[PDB]
Design a binder for this molecule. Structure first.
Ligand SMILES: [Ca+2]
Length: 43
């Protein structure tokens, strides 16, 4: 029954926003999530 939960394999959610992007854009130094959550202290 749950819907829009987590992202499929090979993708990750920006956080509390409904959206998923490939690891390629993860900490890639590019604005995409909008809230800059993926670029938040990437380490
Ligand atoms: Ca990014």
């Amino acid at each position: 029954g749950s819907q829009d939960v987590k992202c499929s394999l090979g993708y990750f959610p920006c956080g509390n926003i409904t959206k998923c992007l490939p690891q390629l854009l993860h900490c890639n130094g590019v604005d995409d999530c909008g809230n800059q959550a993926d670029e938040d202290n990437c380490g």
